[PDB]
Design a protein around this ligand. Structure first.
Ligand SMILES: [Mg+2]
Ligand SMILES: [Mg+2]
Ligand SMILES: [Mg+2]
Ligand SMILES: [Mg+2]
Ligand SMILES: [Mg+2]
Ligand SMILES: [Mg+2]
Ligand SMILES: [Mg+2]
Ligand SMILES: [Mg+2]
Ligand SMILES: [Mg+2]
Ligand SMILES: [Mg+2]
Ligand SMILES: [Mg+2]
Ligand SMILES: [Mg+2]
Ligand SMILES: [Mg+2]
Ligand SMILES: [Mg+2]
Ligand SMILES: [Mg+2]
Ligand SMILES: [Mg+2]
Ligand SMILES: [Mg+2]
Ligand SMILES: [Mg+2]
Ligand SMILES: [Mg+2]
Ligand SMILES: [Mg+2]
Ligand SMILES: [Mg+2]
Ligand SMILES: [Mg+2]
Ligand SMILES: [Mg+2]
Ligand SMILES: [Mg+2]
Ligand SMILES: [Mg+2]
Ligand SMILES: [Mg+2]
Ligand SMILES: [Mg+2]
Ligand SMILES: [Mg+2]
Ligand SMILES: [Mg+2]
Ligand SMILES: [Mg+2]
Ligand SMILES: [Mg+2]
Ligand SMILES: [Mg+2]
Ligand SMILES: [Mg+2]
Ligand SMILES: [Mg+2]
Ligand SMILES: [Mg+2]
Ligand SMILES: [Mg+2]
Ligand SMILES: [Mg+2]
Ligand SMILES: [Mg+2]
Ligand SMILES: [Mg+2]
Ligand SMILES: [Mg+2]
Ligand SMILES: [Mg+2]
Ligand SMILES: [Mg+2]
Ligand SMILES: [Mg+2]
Ligand SMILES: [Zn+2]
Ligand SMILES: [Zn+2]
Lengths: 91, 50, 149, 114, 60, 69
RNA sequence: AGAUCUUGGUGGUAGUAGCAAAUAUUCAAACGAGAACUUUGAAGGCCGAAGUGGAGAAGGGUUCCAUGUGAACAGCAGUUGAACAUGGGUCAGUCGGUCCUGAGAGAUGGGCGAGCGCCGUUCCGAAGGGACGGGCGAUGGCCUCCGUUGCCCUCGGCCGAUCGAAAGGGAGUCGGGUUCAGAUCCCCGAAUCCGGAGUGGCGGAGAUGGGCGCCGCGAGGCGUCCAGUGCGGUAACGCGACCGAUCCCGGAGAAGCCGGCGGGAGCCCCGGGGAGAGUUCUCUUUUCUUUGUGAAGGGCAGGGCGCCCUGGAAUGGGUUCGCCCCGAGAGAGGGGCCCGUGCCUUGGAAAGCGUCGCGGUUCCGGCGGCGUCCGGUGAGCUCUCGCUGGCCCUUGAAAAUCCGGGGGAGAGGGUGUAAAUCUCGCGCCGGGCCGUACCCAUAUCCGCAGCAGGUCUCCAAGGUGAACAGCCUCUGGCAUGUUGGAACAAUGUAGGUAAGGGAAGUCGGCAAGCCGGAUCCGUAACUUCGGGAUAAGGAUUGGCUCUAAGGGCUGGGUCGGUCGCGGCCGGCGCCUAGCAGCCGACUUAGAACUGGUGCGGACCAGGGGAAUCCGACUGUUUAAUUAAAACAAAGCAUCGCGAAGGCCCG
RNA sequence: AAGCCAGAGGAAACUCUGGUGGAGGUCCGUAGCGGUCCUGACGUGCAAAUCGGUCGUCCGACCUGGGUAUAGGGGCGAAAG
């Protein structure tokens, strides 16, 4: 059955630290402990090892990513911008 | 302790050797003025320097 | 330990003797193991590559920027941070960059930097939530944390 | 029941003070001080996490008195690299040299026109 | 069993006993006594008897 | 210690230069011949008794034939 | 005569306070002048395996052991003593130090300083003193030819001395016996590591074959030529060696905490067979004790594998307690490897142990007989191994040391009973120095002491029980904590009970008391939705006799159509709603009967509710009068600083 | 607590129920560490700070040995001079 109405993963913190702080850390912890689909082997085994380090158990590929998510939106926009400036730089 | 260095063991050896009573014939000597070994040490009364 | 940015262990070939040289680059976000990174003037614009700022376009952003033309990386090293190449002048061989603090700096066109943003993402978004987590955070840095007013 | 004592002057449960129980011919239980569990080599590729096969897992200084066969495998890079990554390196070397030949031919034929 | 100089090692004790007693010894065990003297347990070769050697030394 | 399997190996082991003695142990179920070499104690286990006697008379000379009974 | 004068001596107090923390002693005998206290025996108890047991580290330093004494000391005594006196006692290649580096300490160069010096530890150094490689030579000499030696060439960044761990890293010793006191050290027996062999110690490997001319009945011999730095497996990988330098690459050393499983051992438990004891008033085929195989080899189980081959999977399947895994190769079949501490074997029974005897060497590793057996259990406890997960803005040493690979500079011989070479087998020699006794604590340490204090660890039985709780017991230990005897006043300290009332006592429910375990129900306001919550409240609980439910192993043939009362194929048949037998733990629920309604019967073991103030919480704090509302904290906000910098030491 | 399984209800979105799982500066509670109250004992004490019961915490900002570094107007201090 459903065990918690709204706290979900931050039910381990009990009543402590304040509702808003628990809500703020809930999505961060969900993304932190989630398993992402590896972009090299295609298996959903790419999980965080330490902060910023993401390791796939299947192909043993280690990727430098965000603190809590596999890639940050900042880095994605940066990669797109660098691609555009590369294709602009050459002709 | 059971573990010890050579210098410590030698120091304890000397302290053992010089902790004995005077010979009995010392009191027979001319002008003795010595009655007993006043430097006798007991392991429980007083502790060594080290 | 003690920093939020991951470090990259990169192996180069020694150009003058038969040996393997291992470097400890700061991991720009997006790089992975088994990837080739190219360092030098003729390197292309890719995440993880190192090339002088004088050879980069007017809107590119960099990861581990040199304060002086010849030392190793000094700027934008902390996790999530980056500096932006703004303007050039081929004469006087200068380049203007925007630092993470928002200040503008003029540096030599020969300063090298890694393309991309340093990994470690938005580490400061997560509330610490515990005195113990702060204790473990600062135990690996230095003795500064329990701060009496 | 019979209770046991350490047989050496190291009285702390450290990693070098590990024991096991042995029944002597005198019908009494004693400690026997064991050796640390050795590890087989890891592959020089550094990619796949398994340890090599055909190599006896012992402490490093024990390898000095072992015969040569016990420490390697009859193959190129045997006892230092795994078989799968050796096959991968063979294929990779051959294919990259083939690619070099292809690009050499491609530039030699492209320069035909001034 | 001999009382030997504290500076003498096992090889020196073995050679000294061999020379000045004309016997052959198997091994030498050495401890330094609590009084500071050094004591050596010198075991003779199997073809030698410690008893008659002790007799001719004069420590019977 | 080492266990000698067949009779021939025990024969040329007993004739080694470093073999100090050979011991014959009569057990209820077998007879054990024990040659004392420099490094090991080589034991040959003979199930029957007639082969044991043949081996007893076929031992090399100049070697101690100490009986353990 | 004074100075709370200095030093020494002496009174009253005063035979006074006192010799009261941790349950406990009694009887007989011995020695002895002398016994509450010593010793032996018997009894009653205690510590109750998180010990009052058995062993260590630090510290002590002879307190250890034996003999003797009864001066002093052991706050009573002592025939005793950790006291005194006299002698004795610590044995190592394989147990440690020694070696390595850690945090760090610290010379040299340099810098500074009036100066002793101190700053700095890679920074402002010409910081490698080594090398199998080649040449030039000295022939030093068994001048064959290999070992010496000097110089030259070539190579050579530990880029920094040195110190720093008796708990980190670190090769290799175990079983039995032995003393008054020592043993993993002595003796006996089994091994093992490292180093060395120049004149090479022995074998084995390299490595000893094909072609052609001939002889020769063939088989086999002669001459000549050409090979030969091993071999097998599809593979994983295997076999006993298996040429190889400078150089390069890699591995091991070398890694946190926690969870859940499984394998192995030790202990515990149950059923038998022995041997010796205990009870026997009655019963008890009964109760208790005991009932081995080290290291190192070989073999085999067992555990694990992210190792290989075949093959190609959806009607997706396999699988765990949980997970998880698969066209990047599942399931299935067949293999490979690692660990092997388990079992068998060499060790090995000759030893050890238990018993029953027989000789004596005043005090025998004496001699002998028999035995040392068969099973079954398990969420059991403890180690250990492994698998798989979780947590981290925490990612949980380094270096000595050892090894593997890449590469192929070179070396080796002309087909010889051959060479260089060998990580294979066996053999020969050596392992120096220091520590080693004992205590390790209500008496061997520190606290002025034989001080209720303090002081780091290892092993860990039975019952009850959730339990390493508390209570009782076995092995082991002890004598009640620096005295006893006789009485049972007051006052006290510690522990109980108290009719009727129930906080009227008191600043104040201080103190005490009530509740308490488990099962079955049942739970409010409020809330940050997680909690509150064991809310509150109620019922049951013993003993005995049963009854149901929860499992594991084997075997299911239709048959001589025949001969390996038995075997190969086959005409020869329908458990397919699954049966037959054997064995096995505990656990749950229900029922009857039953005791003077008593049953978590001892032990263990929350009183509850309604509010107000403060601090969010967990944490910390004035060692020795304040544990708090104080400090910290996460969260929030502000400030400085782009390194010629901010803050700070000097 | 998340994650997972099954059953049921839904047009979907998803929801409900029973299990499994074993998180947490979580709770009760030993050893350990601490030291609330009796303002108990003692107060020429066992003790120049101890003892009894009762207590706080007991997977963590946990307890602890050894080795190290910081030295007096200095050190060090989750802060009490
Ligand atoms: Mg003392
Ligand atoms: Mg503050
Ligand atoms: Mg050690
Ligand atoms: Mg065994
Ligand atoms: Mg010695
Ligand atoms: Mg006067
Ligand atoms: Mg009195
Ligand atoms: Mg009294
Ligand atoms: Mg009793
Ligand atoms: Mg008791
Ligand atoms: Mg003890
Ligand atoms: Mg004594
Ligand atoms: Mg007295
Ligand atoms: Mg004395
Ligand atoms: Mg150098
Ligand atoms: Mg050192
Ligand atoms: Mg002893
Ligand atoms: Mg055995
Ligand atoms: Mg398969
Ligand atoms: Mg026997
Ligand atoms: Mg000892
Ligand atoms: Mg006492
Ligand atoms: Mg005490
Ligand atoms: Mg003192
Ligand atoms: Mg009493
Ligand atoms: Mg008494
Ligand atoms: Mg009353
Ligand atoms: Mg009443
Ligand atoms: Mg009142
Ligand atoms: Mg009143
Ligand atoms: Mg009260
Ligand atoms: Mg309430
Ligand atoms: Mg009943
Ligand atoms: Mg508070
Ligand atoms: Mg608040
Ligand atoms: Mg405190
Ligand atoms: Mg206080
Ligand atoms: Mg207080
Ligand atoms: Mg606020
Ligand atoms: Mg807690
Ligand atoms: Mg608690
Ligand atoms: Mg008081
Ligand atoms: Mg103040
Ligand atoms: Zn992947
Ligand atoms: Zn690999």
């Amino acid at each position: 059955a459903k065990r918690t109405k709204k706290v979900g993963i931050v039910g381990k913190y009990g009543t402590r630290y304040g509702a808003s702080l628990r809500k703020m850390v809930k999505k961060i912890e969900i993304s932190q402990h989630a398993k992402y689909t590896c972009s090299f082997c295609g298996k959903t085994k790419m999980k965080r090892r330490a902060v910023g380090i993401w390791h796939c158990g299947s192909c043993m590929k280690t990727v430098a990513g965000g603190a809590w998510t596999y890639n940050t939106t900042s880095a994605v926009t940066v990669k797109s911008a660098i691609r555009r400036l590369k294709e602009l730089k050459d002709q | 302790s059971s573990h010890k260095t050579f210098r410590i063991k030698r120091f304890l050896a000397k302290k053992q050797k010089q902790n004995r009573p005077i010979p009995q014939w010392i009191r027979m000597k001319t002008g003795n003025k010595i009655r007993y070994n006043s430097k006798r040490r007991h392991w429980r009364r007083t502790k060594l320097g080290l | 330990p003690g920093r939020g940015a991951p470090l990259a262990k990169v192996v180069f070939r020694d150009p003058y003797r038969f040996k393997k040289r291992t470097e400890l680059f700061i991991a720009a976000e997006g790089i992975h193991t088994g990837q080739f990174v190219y360092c030098g003037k003729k390197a292309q614009l890719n995440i993880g590559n190192v090339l002088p700022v004088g050879t980069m376009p007017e809107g590119t952003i960099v990861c581990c920027l040199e304060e002086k033309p010849g030392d190793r990386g000094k700027l934008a090293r902390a996790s999530g941070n980056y500096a932006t190449v703004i303007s050039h002048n081929p004469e006087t061989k200068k380049t203007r960059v925007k630092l993470p603090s928002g200040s503008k700096k003029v540096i030599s066109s020969a300063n090298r930097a890694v393309v991309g943003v340093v990994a470690g993402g938005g580490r400061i978004d997560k509330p610490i939530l515990k005195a113990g987590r702060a204790y473990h955070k600062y135990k690996a840095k230095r003795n500064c944390w329990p701060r009496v007013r | 029941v019979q209770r046991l004592t350490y047989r050496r002057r190291l009285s702390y449960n450290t990693a070098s003070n590990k024991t096991r129980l042995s029944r002597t011919p005198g019908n009494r239980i004693v400690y026997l001080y064991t050796k640390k569990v050795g590890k087989a080599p890891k592959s020089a590729c550094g990619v796949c996490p398994g340890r090599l096969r055909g190599v006896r897992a012992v402490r490093p200084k024990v390898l000095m008195r072992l015969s040569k066969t016990k420490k390697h495998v009859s193959r190129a890079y045997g006892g230092s690299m795994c078989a799968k990554c050796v096959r991968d390196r063979i294929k990779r070397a051959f294919l990259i040299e083939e690619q070099k030949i292809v690009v050499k031919v491609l530039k030699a034929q492209a320069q035909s026109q001034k | 069993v001999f009382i030997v100089d504290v500076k003498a090692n096992k090889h020196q004790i073995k050679q000294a006993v061999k020379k000045l007693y004309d016997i052959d010894v198997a091994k030498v065990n050495t401890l330094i006594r609590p009084d500071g003297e050094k004591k050596a347990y010198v075991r003779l070769a199997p073809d030698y008897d410690a008893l008659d050697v002790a007799n001719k030394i004069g420590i019977i | 210690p080492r266990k000698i399997e067949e009779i021939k190996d025990f024969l040329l082991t007993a004739r080694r230069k470093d073999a100090k003695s050979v011991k014959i142990k009569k057990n209820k179920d077998n007879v054990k011949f024990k040659v004392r070499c420099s490094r090991y104690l080589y034991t040959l286990v003979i199930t029957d008794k007639e082969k044991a006697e043949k081996l007893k008379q076929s031992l090399p000379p100049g070697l101690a034939v100490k009986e353990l009974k």
